[PDB]
Structure formats: structure tokens, C-alpha cells
Amino acid sequence: MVSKGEELFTGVVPILVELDGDVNGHKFSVSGEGEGDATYGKLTLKFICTTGKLPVPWPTLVTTLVQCFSRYPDHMKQHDFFKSAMPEGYVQERTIFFKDDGNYKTRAEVKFEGDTLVNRIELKGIDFKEDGNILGHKLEYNYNEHNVYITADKQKNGIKANFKIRHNIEDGSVQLADHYQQNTPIGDGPVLLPDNHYLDTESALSKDPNEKRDHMVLLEEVEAAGITL
């Protein structure tokens, strides 16, 4: 295998996610747990809003709540920055602009803590409309397939990405969320800096019929593409 960190993903890896958020002064926390199987680009996670009611729609948090679990095809193994940064990990930072509404700013560290892949996130949201699609909870509980476009940032020993998320609104229209992303390694070790490619990302949201807390069950399937065999 072409990076040392890639070896850590040959099996099923436990995942922990911890998010602290503040959107227009509405504070919240989310904890998630599950597991990832990068060989197949799959993960399964269950998230709980540990502070009671989530003040924003669950779908708006999907992108924030571990791209090291993507399946890179055999011919693309030298382009997997995310696993190459492991176990020391990477900082992932985004600004997410909701069209005609507010924005989220996120900073996360994704790294191994023992045998567990941990995503710890700080999220701040500002300039939302209290009666808009986000704070007004007008988004459908579902999720579309998206391509995440990745480019190397040699200057920061890292990568950049940008993409637009389409969130279906309750009335059949769409709330757009423009994502700008930067990832930089935490460690000083060498990482893989990729040629341009994308991650074809599929997400399915559901509920645990036994769960009384505000929560989201998420299954994701992701494969890298855009570099010909």
C-alpha cells in the first residue's frame, strides 16, 4: 500500500464524531458513533443531539459530520491525501454559504485516537434568518448525490475542495449550500498530494424507530473518480 496511513483502513474502523455548534446564538452539541469500511467506501453512523432539540435541520450538518473513508480505485491510490495524513490526521476547515441565508464556518480535526477514527468539530453560524429554511426547519429529511471536487494545495501540503450541496425544501424547491474546503496535515510526515479528481458521494438518512432523542442515522457510500484507467 502506497501510504502508511492507508494501511489503517484495510478493515472496519470504529468512528467517533463530536460537534459543538452555535448558530445565531442557538447552541447545540452532537455526538456520533459507528464504523467505516474504506475498502468499499462505506460508513454507518448514528448521531444524537445531546443538548435536546437540534436548532438546524439534520441535513445541513451532513457534510460537517471523514473523507478518509472514501474508496479510491486501485489506479488512483497515489491520490488519497486523506488516508496519507493518518494517523496524525488533518485539520478540515470550511465556509458553507446558504444561498439567501446565513453561513457556517467549521474547523475540525480528524485523527486516530487509539484504534478509533475521531472527527472533532467546532461550528459557528451567523446571519441566518430566524424564519428561513434553516432556522425555520423547512428542509426535507433526505439527501442528494454530489461530486466533491478536489485539488492539491502544494503551498499548504494539503488539499482544497469546493462543491455545492442541493438541499430539497419541503415545497419541492432547493436550498443551495456553497462549500469551500481546505485540509492540511496535522503531522510533519509526507502526504500524498493528488491530481485533480472528485469524490462521488452518496448519503442516505433514516431514523432509529427505538430512539426518542433527536437523531440521525446516516449511511454513506463514496468512491473517488475522474482519473481514467
- Residue ranges of alpha helices (H) inside 48-130 are 81-84
Name the residue ranges covered by the structural domains of the chain: 1-229
Cell of 94: 470550511
Cell of 69: 473513508
Residue count of the chain: 229
End-to-end C-alpha distance for the chain, whole angstroms: 18
CA distance 126 to 129: 9
* CATH of 1-229 among 2.40.155.10, 2.60.40.2550, 3.40.50.300, 2.40.50.220: 2.40.155.10
Stated resolution in angstroms: 1.7
Q: Quickly tell me which residue has 458513533 as its cell.
A: 33
Q: How was this structure determined?
A: X-ray
Asked if residue 140 lies in contact with residue 59, where contact means CB atoms within 8 angstroms, the answer is yes
Instruction: Work out whether the CA dihedral 145, 168, 69, 40 comes out positive or negative.
Output: negative
Distances (CA, A) of 58 to 63, 85, 135, 208: 10, 28, 11, 14
